[PDB]
Ligand binder design. Structure first.
Ligand code: NA
Lengths: 646, 651
C-alpha cells in the first residue's frame, strides 16, 4: 500500500529540529489515504528525530492507574497520535526518537489495525535521576557521586538544583527539581539486583555541607555526619524521581488490533505502555532497558506494561524488561463500588482508588457481574447487560446524560439486579472487558517489585519466561476490592516452563485481598503450575489463597547456592482440590505445605514428595548416603522432620 | 502430739544469732519422736530467726529445671531439712526467717505427711538487686537511682561494687558483684506491669561517667550520653540478677502428702518451690511478694512453684504471686530420649536439656509410655512397666548398677517394647508420675512471663483465679520434646471462672511444639474453657494447637479500655484442632469475635450457638436495630461476617 514519508512533510533525519509538527502533517496525510481504503505506512528515513511537547497534539485524557481526577495533569501532550483511523503502520525503520520535557511518546485512540514498529524511545533529560555512589570516605566524610551526562544541574552551596532541557519555542525550562527527588530505589551495580529500601530517604542528600565538581561527571559531596546507610553506599545507584504519573508513556485507548513490535524503550516518562478499553494488543520484541551508550540504569519511570480493562488477546512475546520503578506487567480491570441503588435496574457506581477515575469502564451492550467485597465472590445469577451509561467519557465530557462526577458512573441494566446487591458491600466488574493473556518467551530482571500481575477470567498463559531477581513475588495474582480495586477473578491459568532465579520473595503468590475467607467457594479456579524451574534460597515457591482445582506438577526445585532456616516451600490458604504430582526437589529444601483456613483432605500429595503440615525436608535419595567422615548427619524422619544432628 | 521447741536447742528469737545448729538439733529430736509413732510439731517461739548457710545441712542433690549436671552447684545448703521421716509439722507461729548468702530455705526428702506453716521467708541481702530510676535529667545527663536499704555497696571511680552480708563464723562476704548483674527485667512502678525488655542490656549501667551518693538511699549516675532507653526510664525498677539457679528455693523430693500453708515468701534465692517425684503437695495461703516494709519489688529469683514429675494431687489455693523472674507455676514431667535400644526389653534414655538431669525419673514398678517427637503422639500400645533401673539416684550415687552418666538412665521393661520405637525419634514419659492439678482462688500479677504452665494427663482444674498483667500467655499448655523436653499430653483440662486483665499476650495459649501437625490424632484432648472473663485490648483470648474436644462456652469478653481495616488480632486461633464448640459467649461491641484457622477446616468448628465467625474478623457491631451515633462520629458499616464494608462520617 501507500507510503507516507515524514521527510516530505518537513522532518529530515538527524536535523536537530523539532519534528512534532511534521509528524502531525504526515499523520493527517496517512489518515486521508486510510479513509479511502488504503493500507498506509508512515516511514521515518533512518536517523534521530527530536519530538518536543510544545506543538505536539494535546488532549484531555483520564488514564487508568495514573493520576485519577487530578485537574493539574488532565491534559496530555502526545508525540505521535493516531486518532479515529485505521490500517496505519508507523515504521521508524530503525530510527531513534528522542522526546523532551514531560509527555506521552505515542498513542492510538479509537483506531483499528494500527502498528508501531522499529524505533527506539528515549528522553533528552530523563525524569529519573540515576546517581551512583562510586566511593565513600568516612574519614573525610565525603562521597564521590557519578552523575550521568544526560542530567543538567547547578550547584549552590550545599544544594544541587536539577533542570531539564529548555523549550526551543519559549526558552522555558520544562522541569526543575532540588537535591533529593521524592522517591528513590536502589540498584546494586555488583549484583544487578534492584530493590526498594526506605524510598523516602536518600542517603546521598542527608546532612550535606557542600558539593564540588570533580570533573569527568563526578561530584564530591561533603557531610557533617556519616550515616551507616551512606557508609555502605559504595557501588549503589540511587534512582530517584517524582511519583506523579502525569502522562502515560504510551496510550492505547478504545482501539482494536494494535501491534507494538521491535521498539527499544530506553526511557519512558510518567508511566508505561497503557492499554485501556482496547480489543487485542500484541507486544513483540520490545526491549525496556537503557542502552549501551548511557550510564543510566532506569528505563521506566514506573510500570512498563499496563493493560487496564482490555479484551481480546493481550500478547507479550520475545521481550525484555529491565529496571522499571514498578511492576513490569499488570493486566487487570477496575471494580467500581455500588454507591446508590436508583431502582431495580439502575445503579450509581464509583471509582474508589484515587489514581483510577474519569474514564468509561462500561459501554452499552457490555455485560457486568456483581461481587460481594468481603469474600470477593460473585453474586449468584448476577450477570446483566448494560442498556445505558451516564458518566465521564474520559476526555472531560459526558457519556449519556453524564453523572456530574469524574468518579461516578450511572448504569442502567437490562433486568432487575439481584435483590441482595446493596450499597458499599457490592462492587461491579465489566466482564466483557476481560482479556485472554499470553505472556511468553520474555526476560524479567532488575525489578524491585513483582514481575507479572494478571487478573482476568479468560485464558491466561504465562510460559517460558525467565524471572531473575524480582524483589517481590515473580507472579502475583490478586483480585482486590479493598485498596486497589483491581479486578478480576481467574478461571483458567497456566504457568508453564518458566525459570525463577534470585527470587526476593515467593516465586508465585496468589492473594486476592478478601478479608473473609470462604470455606465453601473460592475466588479463583482452575490453575495449573507445571514444568517450571524454581531456584530457591529460603522463600516459598507457591503461596496460594482461595484457589480451587490447583495443580502443581512436574516442576523442578533446585537450591540456588548448592532447626532448619527458611520457609516451607508451599502455603495454601482456603484452597480446594489441590494436587501435587511429579515434582523433583533438591536435597535439603523444605518440600512441605503450610495450611491456612483448610485441612489436609483438600490436598492430594500421593504422587509427590511434598508433605502436608510438616517441613518435608528432602533427604539424600536412596538407602545409602555417602557422607564425609568430617561432616555431621542430620537424621530425617518420614515427614521430613529432623530428629537428631550428630 | 509432742512439741519440740527450737528455743531448747540454743536458738534465741530476735537475737541475730545463727539458728541453723539449733534447728538441726530440734529436727533430730522431732525425728526420734516421729519414729516412736508420735505426731510432732517443731515450734518457733514467735520472732525473727536468722539462719546462716555455714553450719546448715549440706546435700548433694540434682534438681529439675536448675543446673542439671553442673558439678560447681551439686551441693546445696538447706536451712530446715526434714529427711527420712514422717508426721512432723514445722510451725513458725508467725516467725520471720531471714536466710543469708545463697542457700535453700527449707526442704523435705523421702518423708511422709510433713507440713511447713506460719512463717515468712526472706534473705538479709537478696540476690536480685532492684534499682528504681526515679528521675532523669537529659540536659545534665544524669539519672537519680533509688537503692533499697537492704543492699550493700561501695563506689569506686565510676563503678559500684555490690556485696552481701558476712559470715559470723569466718567474717567473709558470701558474694560480691559489680555494676550491672547479667540479667535485668522491668517493673513499671506507675502501672504495676513487669516485662522483659533487652534483658542483657541494663540502661542504668551504659556509658556511666560517675556515681555520686545523694543520701537517703539515692545515687546520682552521670553519663557521657543519654540513650533513648535511659531517657524514658523514669519510674522503672530495673530488677537485675545472675541467672544460675544454684539452689532450689524449697525442695520437696520423693515425699508423700506435703503441705505448705500460711507462708509469706518475701524473697526466695536461686529458684522457687520445687516438688520432685513427690506424691501430693498442697499449697494454701502462700503469698509470694515483697511486703510493704521494703523498697524492693522482686520476690523470686526465678519461678515460684515448680512441680516436676510429681503424682497424686497438686493443689495451689488461696495464694498470691507477685514479681518472679520466671513463670509463677509450672507443673510438668520430663521426656527422656531413647538413645540406645539394648534389647527388646532394655533401653537407655537421656536427659536432653542441660538444666534437668542427674536424678531418677523412673522407679521400679512405674509405668512408661513412648512418644514420637515429630507429631508428639503416643506410640500405640506402648505402655510398659519398669522392672529395673540403672542410673543416677539424685544425690551422686547409683540406682541398680548405675549408668556411668548423670544424663543417662537404663530401663528394663516388663515386655518387649513396640518395634517402631527407635533411637532419637522417640522419647519416654513416666506416666505414673503425672499429677492431678487443682489451682484455684489465687492472684497472679506483676509477672513478665506466663502465669501458669501445666502439662499432665490427669484431671486439671484452673478455677476462680485472677491474672492481671501477665507479660506472656496467662495460661500456657505445651508438651515439648523439641527444646525443653517437658511432658506431658493433657486429657482433662477445665479452665473456669478466671479473670484475665491487661494480658500481655494471648490469654490462653495451647501450643505443643510438634513440628509435624498430625491430620488424624491430636496431642491434647477434652479441654473446656467456661465462665471466664477476658478483658481484651488487641491480643487473642485463645490460641490453641492440636486439641480435640475443645469447648469455649459461657465466657465474657470485655474491651479493656471502653473509650475508643481494624487493629488487633482476631480473638481466636485454632491450629490442627478437632471437634471444637463455641457457645453462649458474650462479646463487647468492637472486639473481633473471629477465628483464624491453621491446619484444619471450618467443619471442625461448631459456632451455631455463638457469635464467633470462622475465617472472618467477626467484629461485633452495636447491638439492636437502631444505633445511636453522635453526629460528629463516623459510622463503620459491618457486614454479616463482621467485616467492615464502608467508613463514613456522613451517617
Ligand atoms: Na477496513
Amino acid at each position: 500500500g501507500d507510503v507516507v514519508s515524514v521527510a516530505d512533510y518537513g522532518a529530515a533525519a538527524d536535523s536537530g529540529e523539532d519534528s512534532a509538527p511534521a509528524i502531525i502533517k504526515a499523520v493527517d496525510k496517512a489518515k486521508e489515504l486510510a479513509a479511502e481504503g488504503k493500507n498506509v505506512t508512515i516511514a521515518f528515513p533512518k536517523g534521530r528525530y527530536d519530538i518536543y511537547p510544545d506543538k505536539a497534539e494535546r488532549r484531555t485524557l483520564y488514564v487508568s492507574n495514573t493520576v485519577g481526577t487530578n485537574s493539574s495533569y488532565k491534559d496530555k501532550k502526545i508525540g505521535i497520535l493516531l486518532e479515529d483511523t485505521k490500517n496505519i503502520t508507523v515504521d521508524g525503520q530503525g530510527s531513534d526518537f528522542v522526546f523532551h520535557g514531560k509527555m506521552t511518546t505515542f498513542a492510538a485512540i479509537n483506531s483499528r489495525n494500527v502498528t508501531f514498529k522499529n524505533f527506539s524511545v528515549d528522553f533528552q533529560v530523563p525524569t529519573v535521576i540515576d546517581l551512583t555512589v562510586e566511593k565513600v570516605d568516612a574519614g573525610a566524610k565525603t562521597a564521590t557521586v557519578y552523575v550521568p551526562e544526560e542530567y543538567n544541574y547547578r550547584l549552590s552551596g550545599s544544594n544541587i538544583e536539577w533542570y531539564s532541557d529548555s523549550s526551543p519555542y519559549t526558552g522555558a525550562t520544562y522541569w526543575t527539581a532540588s537535591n533529593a527527588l521524592p522517591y528513590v530505589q536502589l540498584y546494586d551495580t555488583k549484583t544487578g539486583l534492584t530493590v526498594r529500601g526506605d524510598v523516602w530517604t536518600n542517603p546521598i542528600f542527608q546532612n550535606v555541607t557542600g558539593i564540588t565538581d570533580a570533573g569527568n561527571h563526578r561530584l564530591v559531596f561533603s557531610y557533617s555526619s556519616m550515616s551507616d546507610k551512606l557508609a555502605n553506599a559504595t557501588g549503589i545507584s540511587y534512582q530517584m524521581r517524582q511519583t506523579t504519573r502525569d502522562h502515560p508513556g504510551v496510550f492505547l485507548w478504545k482501539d482494536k488490533d494494535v501491534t507494538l513490535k521491535g521498539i527499544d524503550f530506553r526511557f519512558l516518562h510518567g508511566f508505561g505502555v497503557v492499554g485501556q478499553s482496547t480489543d487485542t494488543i500484541t507486544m513483540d520484541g520490545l526491549h525496556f532497558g537503557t542502552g549501551e551508550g548511557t550510564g543510566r540504569s532506569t528505563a521506566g519511570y514506573a510500570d512498563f506494561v499496563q493493560m487496564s480493562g482490555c479484551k481480546g488477546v493481550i500478547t507479550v512475546a520475545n521481550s525484555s524488561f529491565s529496571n522499571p520503578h514498578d511492576d513490569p506487567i499488570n493486566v487487570h480491570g477496575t471494580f467500581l463500588q455500588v454507591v446508590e441503588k436508583i431502582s431495580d435496574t439502575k445503579i450509581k457506581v464509583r471509582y474508589m482508588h484515587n489514581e483510577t477515575a474519569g474514564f468509561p469502564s462500561f459501554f452499552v451492550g457490555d455485560q457486568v457481574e456483581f461481587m460481594t467485597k468481603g469474600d470477593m465472590l460473585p453474586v449468584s445469577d448476577s450477570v446483566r447487560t448494560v442498556t445505558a451509561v451516564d458518566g465521564p467519557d474520559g476526555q472531560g465530557g459526558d457519556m449519556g446524560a453524564g453523572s456530574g462526577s469524574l468518579t461516578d458512573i450511572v448504569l442502567t441494566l437490562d433486568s432487575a439486579i439481584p435483590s441482595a446487591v446493596a450499597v458499599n458491600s457490592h462492587v461491579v466488574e465489566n466482564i466483557t472487558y476481560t482479556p485472554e493473556v499470553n505472556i511468553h518467551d520474555n526476560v524479567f530482571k532488575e525489578t524491585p517489585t513483582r514481575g507479572i500481575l494478571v487478573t482476568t477470567r479468560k485464558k491466561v498463559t504465562i510460559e517460558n519466561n525467565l524471572f531473575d531477581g524480582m524483589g517481590m513475588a515473580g507472579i502475583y495474582i490478586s483480585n482486590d476490592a479493598q485498596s486497589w480495586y483491581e479486578s478480576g477473578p481467574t478461571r483458567d491459568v497456566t504457568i508453564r516452563g518458566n525459570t525463577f532465579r534470585r527470587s526476593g520473595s515467593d516465586a508465585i503468590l496468589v492473594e486476592p485481598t478478601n478479608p473473609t475467607v470462604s470455606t465453601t467457594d473460592t475466588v479463583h479456579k482452575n490453575m495449573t503450575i507445571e514444568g517450571n524451574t524454581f531456584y530457591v534460597n529460603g522463600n516459598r515457591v507457591l503461596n496460594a489463597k482461595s484457589v480451587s482445582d490447583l495443580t502443581f506438577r512436574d516442576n523442578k526445585i533446585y537450591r540456588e547456592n548448592p532447626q532448619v532456616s527458611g520457609s516451607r516451600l508451599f502455603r495454601l490458604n482456603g484452597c480446594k482440590q489441590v494436587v501435587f504430582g511429579g515434582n523433583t526437589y533438591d536435597v535439603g529444601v523444605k518440600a512441605g505445605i503450610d495450611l491456612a483456613n483448610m485441612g489436609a483432605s483438600e490436598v492430594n500429595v500421593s504422587d509427590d514428595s511434598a508433605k502436608v503440615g510438616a517441613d518435608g525436608l528432602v533427604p539424600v535419595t536412596g538407602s545409602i548416603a555417602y557422607v564425609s567422615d568430617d561432616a555431621a548427619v542430620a537424621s530425617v524422619d518420614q515427614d521430613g522432620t529432623i530428629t537428631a544432628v550428630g
